[PDB]
Structures are given as structure tokens and as C-alpha cells.
Amino acid sequence: NSVSVDLPGSMKVLVSKSSNADGKYDLIATVDALELSGTSDKNNGSGVLEGVKADASKVKLTISDDLGQTTLEVFKSDGSTLVSKKVTSKDKVLGDVKFNEKGEVSEKIITRADGTRLEYTGIKSDGSGKAKEVLKGYVLEGTLTAEKTTLVVKEGTVTLSKNISKSGAVSVELNDTDSSAATKKTAAWNSGTSTLTITVNSKKTKDLVFTSSNTITVQQYDSNGTSLEGSAVEITKLDEIKNALK
């Protein structure tokens, strides 16, 4: 009869055990109680399934040839304009996209494999919008442009800016409007190690590491200002970032 196949995005598809006279396989899936069906020229569960919501919206599920990726799309009732698109890629990263009345991207939520998120909302036609990074224990807020995402933490006269470029490269900068040379913070960014080193009064005070695990760690320097001391501590809430900027 049929073979159950496990799919990215918490879905399953039933594929026929044998092909039809055209050599094609039948596909069946139920996604949140909606029944979808289709035919494929592959036997592994890949291909295209379609259905129609109670409100007449068209639904299409596209499963890539190697089963690595699923795309779940909802359209207006004539099938021409997108309403939403949900993509799980082979790295299990989720892209959840909303479109406006004219089919232009208006919201995009990215869920990384570790569960952290980039939330882009109010997206305009120039690709600008509001931005939020949702990390384990805290959230960073800022803006999106076509050039970069900029997330901002403020403490006293210090502004910390985490940039994520259009290509995904992270850089961090720090700016202090403090005028006194004794207490003002400055900072240097090391792209090779994703580390921001803070300096006060010509001595290094701490390293903030922005890790590949989507965490931030802080480590102090010795009173001299040259050697790191102790070991790095992972930030677990926004107040601890603010503390590192004091």
C-alpha cells in the first residue's frame, strides 16, 4: 500500500509502494488536519502535494528530491499571490515568512537549529524593518536595513551595537558619550575571534565573545590590563550584558 516517510518541519508523507502506469507515485499528507495530495516521479516521498483550506486558500507542500528541505506555502484563493511560506532546510533552520496583500515579504522569522531566533517584522519594500534576536535567556532589539541588522543595548552613556550583515557576518561596536578620559569606554572588534575588547583609561577591562553557539560570554582582564584572568562567563540575561557595559 503506502510507505510513511519522515520529513523536515515535523511532517510526514505517505508514498505509494509502487508506481502507476505513467511511472508516477501517489503522495498523501495531513498537515494540521488539512489533507494534501499529489503525484511524484520519485519513489522516496519527495515531490509536490496540494490542498485547499476551508477559506479557499491554496496550500502547497514541496519536498526536495533528497528529502532535505520542505516548503509549505499558502496562497490566496486563485493560487496566484503568496500569503505565507514556511521553509525547513537540511540544517533544520526554519524560515517563516508572511506576505502582504500584494505578495511582498512583510515578516520573516528565522529559527536557528539551536532554537534562537531572528524576528523581522514590519518589513517595507526597501527591505527595512524592525528586528529582534531571541537568545537563551534574553532578547536583543533593533532595526533591519537592506545592509544589516543592528541590535542595540544601552547602559549609561554607553551604546553597544551588534551588527549582522546581509550575508550573516557579525561585527560589534561600542560608543560612549562620556567625556572623562578616566571612565569612558572604548572598544576594538576582532573579527577573527568574534571578540569585542573593552578598554577604560588605556587598559583592557573585558572581552565580550559573541560565539558561534549564539551566546555572549564576558571575561575580565587582570588589573594590569594585559592578561585575561579567571574564565569566561556566559551571559544569561540582559541585565548581565548591561553590567558588562558599566
Distance separating alpha carbons of residues 19 and 86, to the nearest angstrom: 29
For residue 16, the SS3 value is strand
Closest CA to 104 of 128, 78, 134, 88: 128
Distance separating alpha carbons of residues 189 and 213, to the nearest angstrom: 18
Expt. technique: X-ray
Check whether domain 1-100 has CATH 3.40.50.1820, yes or no = no
Resolution in angstrom units: 1.7
For residue 39, the SS3 value is strand
Distance separating alpha carbons of residues 172 and 93, to the nearest angstrom: 24
**Matching fold, domains 1-100 and 101-246:** no
Task: Determine the topology of domain 101-246 in CATH.
Answer: Outer Surface Protein A; domain 3 (3.90.930)
Q: Which three cell numbers stand for residue 105?
A: 515579504
- Domain range list for the chain: 1-100, 101-246
Amino acid at 105: V
